[PDB]
Amino acid sequence: DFHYGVRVDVTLLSKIRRVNEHIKSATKTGVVQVHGSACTPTLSVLSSVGTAGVLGMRIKNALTPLVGHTEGSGDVSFSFRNTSVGSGFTHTRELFGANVLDAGIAFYRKPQFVRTTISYGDNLTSTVHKSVVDQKGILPFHDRMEAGGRTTRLMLCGKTGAFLLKWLRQQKTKEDQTVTVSVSETLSIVTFSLGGVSKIIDFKPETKPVSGWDGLKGKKSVDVGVVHTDALSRVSLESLIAALRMCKVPGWFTPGLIWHSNEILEVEGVPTGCQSGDVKLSVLLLEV
Amino acid sequence: DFHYGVRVDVTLLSKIRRVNEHIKSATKTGVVQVHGSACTPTLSVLSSVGTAGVLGMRIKNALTPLVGHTEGSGDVSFSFRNTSVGSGFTHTRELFGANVLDAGIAFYRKPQFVRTTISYGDNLTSTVHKSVVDQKGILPFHDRMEAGGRTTRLMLCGKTGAFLLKWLRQQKTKEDQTVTVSVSETLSIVTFSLGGVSKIIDFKPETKPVSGWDGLKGKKSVDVGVVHTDALSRVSLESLIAALRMCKVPGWFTPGLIWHSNEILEVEGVPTGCQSGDVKLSVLLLEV
């Protein structure tokens, strides 16, 4: 019984290639998800990053459900590994394939199964992979966190961002360490500290009420942020380097840091163009 | 119309893994073939090596035809690219997969098509690739050359073989050169010459009549060969290095050189054990 299927809009995914291509090695061992409302599901790829971080790429309006499904007009959630055990088939590799024509993901029962179908350039070649949907334990959670309000956020310019990333790298040993990242309202200053060294970065606090990254970026000369209370976080160094790397997509995203109401420090790709409307990218860094 | 199909004996291929794993990068861009008699087809993989060399791995008794086919009891020949254009599917990668359970290649018409089916560990996952058989221009030719007779052959011991290969490598420039390889009966000596340098290797000529490599190998101390007439060959250096590398499979094959009645210098994996009965490996080096 083929209870639910979807048609992947490959033209849209092509436009998005560079983002996927950027995080490909982090996501090979990841998990693919088809979730949200049955009418407009979201395509998300998630995977751990370093010892304490979760990456999430999420794509809207890229899936069209196929008529005749017993799921009604409510929510849907299917979570499977994109590189099935022992296979050479990687869902995201194929979905974003340059030489792709048609593509569809279909879910069926009667065990829970997934059937991905790929059709290539010559309207002749095709691959049909088929695996088990056994990653129910993972829920979409990236778009489910109280932002706006007055949340402590920070946005670095290109210069400062690269300098931070170079500094972070040259501190690493073979064994992972934990970086303490703190924000001081009294001094509009962000500090990164580990080993027996610290990197200090001051910014310009934004007075005016602001929700999101708009009206905060991008000055590209100075570092800006919003801070209503001090924040302290202890995150994995590996996870942090990775996150600042994954969220700097040449011509697509620039890193932005958010200290959530939780204990979670979120590194997010902040859009430098209009092209990335249907895509959201980030890594959640866990407290250590 | 499914005119002809075959079941791949995966247990046998497992035993053979190391050989396939050795040449994998040379064969990714290669061609897969199902040829020979309909009852006992051969599985062969061919691919160019360097600027003037053709590699061929050939596996007997690894295919069982499936009942009900219009091909009668005569020959069969299907030749397709193992990495279909724009795909992530590589036939040999999957056929030799460690986590494989069942595997079958089926040919159909009604254009000429191939459908490879792979079934993995969990009797749950599977991949079905489907492409065009459009490499008719390539014929199996490796097992079709007048050997025995009295053919000029040479067999090097491990010591000499590695020394030759190290010497050959350290002569290469970025642009490919052509090595002249000659055999002197008068002096039981093989010479490798290019640039303005030569490497000389003498051997012990075998008096007694011999067909094949048995009764010629493996002394593993001195270099042996059979020579009835002098031989001269001009081959690609890239193709030669590759060939001496591909035919030295740790615990499986050791290189052997044959100067064919043609102009073709064949580098062949000569069996060091019993395990490699159903497998033949070699590279034909073309005259330049």
Contact call for A120 and B84, based on CB within 8 A: yes
Q: Which residue type, as a one-letter code, is found at position B49?
A: V
Task: Please state, in angstroms and rounded to a whole number, the distance separating the CA atoms of residues A31 and A17.
Answer: 18
Site of tokens 């706006």 = A148
Method: X-ray
CATH of the domain at B61: 3.70.10.10
Residue B66: both structure tokens together: 């499936």
Task: Please state, in angstroms and rounded to a whole number, the distance separating the CA atoms of residues B228 and A159.
Answer: 74
Pairing type for strands A53-59 and A279-285 reads: antiparallel
Q: Does residue B90 sit at the A interface (CB-CB below 8 Å)?
A: yes
Residue A24's domain spans which residues? Answer: 1-288
Contact call for B121 and A86, based on CB within 8 A: yes
Cis peptide upstream of residue B218 (ω within 30 degrees of 0): yes
Residues of A in contact with B130 (CB under 8 A): 125-128
Closest chain B residue by Cα to residue A112 = B124
Calculate ∠ Cα A186-A192-A193, nearest 5°.
110
Q: Give the N- to C-terminal CA distance of chain B in Å, as an integer.
A: 45
Task: Please state, in angstroms and rounded to a whole number, the distance separating the CA atoms of residues A245 and A255.
Answer: 8
Strand partners, A5: A106
Contact call for B99 and A89, based on CB within 8 A: no
Contact call for A127 and B128, based on CB within 8 A: yes
Q: Does residue A114 sit at the B interface (CB-CB below 8 Å)?
A: no
- Residue B35 belongs to what H/E stretch? strand B31-37
The shortest CB-CB distance from A85 to any of B86, B99, B129 is to B99
Residues of B in contact with A131 (CB under 8 A): 124-125
Closest chain A residue by Cα to residue B112 = A124
Write the CB contacts of A1 (distance below 8 Å, at least 6 apart in sequence).
A108, A109, A110
Contact call for B128 and A125, based on CB within 8 A: no
Separate counts of helices (H) and strands (E) for chain A = 4, 19
Contact call for B85 and A121, based on CB within 8 A: yes
Contact call for A97 and B88, based on CB within 8 A: yes
Q: Does residue A129 sit at the B interface (CB-CB below 8 Å)?
A: yes
| Cα–Cα nearest to A283, from A236, A251, A250 | A236
Write the CB contacts of A263 (distance below 8 Å, at least 6 apart in sequence).
A233, A286, A287
Residues of B in contact with A86 (CB under 8 A): 97-100, 120-121, 125
Helix pair angle (A237-246, A10-27), 10° resolution: 160
Residues of B in contact with A112 (CB under 8 A): none
Quote the minimal CA–CA distance from B128 to chain A in Å.
5
Strand partners, B225: B154, B205
Give yes or no for a contact between A223 and A239, defined as CB atoms under 8 angstroms apart.
no
Strand partners, A233: A181
Task: Please state, in angstroms and rounded to a whole number, the distance separating the CA atoms of residues A233 and A53.
Answer: 13
Residues of A in contact with B129 (CB under 8 A): 125-127
Centre a 10 Å sphere on the Cβ of residue A53 and count the other Cβ atoms it contains: 27
Residues of B in contact with A127 (CB under 8 A): 87-89, 127-130
Give the phi and the psi of residue B252 in degrees, each rounded to 5. Answer: -140, -55
Q: Is B75 helix (H, G, I), strand (E, B) or coil?
A: strand
Contact call for B130 and A126, based on CB within 8 A: yes
| Cα–Cα nearest to B255, from B182, B163, B140, B187 | B163
Residues of A in contact with B85 (CB under 8 A): 99, 120-122, 125
Residues of B in contact with A113 (CB under 8 A): 124
Pairing type for strands B197-202 and B189-194 reads: antiparallel
Contact call for B86 and A121, based on CB within 8 A: yes
Contact call for B85 and A126, based on CB within 8 A: no
Per DSSP, A129 falls in state E
Give yes or no for a contact between A285 and A242, defined as CB atoms under 8 angstroms apart.
no
Contact call for A98 and B86, based on CB within 8 A: yes
Give yes or no for a contact between B85 and A125, defined as CB atoms under 8 angstroms apart.
yes
Write the CB contacts of A195 (distance below 8 Å, at least 6 apart in sequence).
A171, A177
Q: Does residue A187 sit at the B interface (CB-CB below 8 Å)?
A: no
Closest chain B residue by Cα to residue A120 = B86
Per DSSP, A86 falls in state T
Quote the minimal CA–CA distance from A131 to chain B in Å.
5
Task: Please state, in angstroms and rounded to a whole number, the distance separating the CA atoms of residues A28 and A206.
Answer: 39
Quote the minimal CA–CA distance from B8 to chain A in Å.
18
Quote the minimal CA–CA distance from A59 to chain B in Å.
23
Write the CB contacts of A74 (distance below 8 Å, at least 6 apart in sequence).
A37, A38
Contact call for A85 and B126, based on CB within 8 A: no
Closest chain B residue by Cα to residue A83 = B125
Task: Please state, in angstroms and rounded to a whole number, the distance separating the CA atoms of residues A177 and B138.
Answer: 57
Residues of B in contact with A111 (CB under 8 A): 124
Calculate ∠ Cα B12-B117-A20, nearest 5°.
115
Residue B38 exposed, middle or buried by CB count within 10 Å (0-12, 13-18, 19+):
middle
Total domains present in chain B:
1
| Cα–Cα nearest to A32, from B12, A41, B177, B96 | A41
Cis peptide upstream of residue A218 (ω within 30 degrees of 0): yes
Task: Please state, in angstroms and rounded to a whole number, the distance separating the CA atoms of residues A103 and B152.
Answer: 56
Contact call for B90 and A87, based on CB within 8 A: no
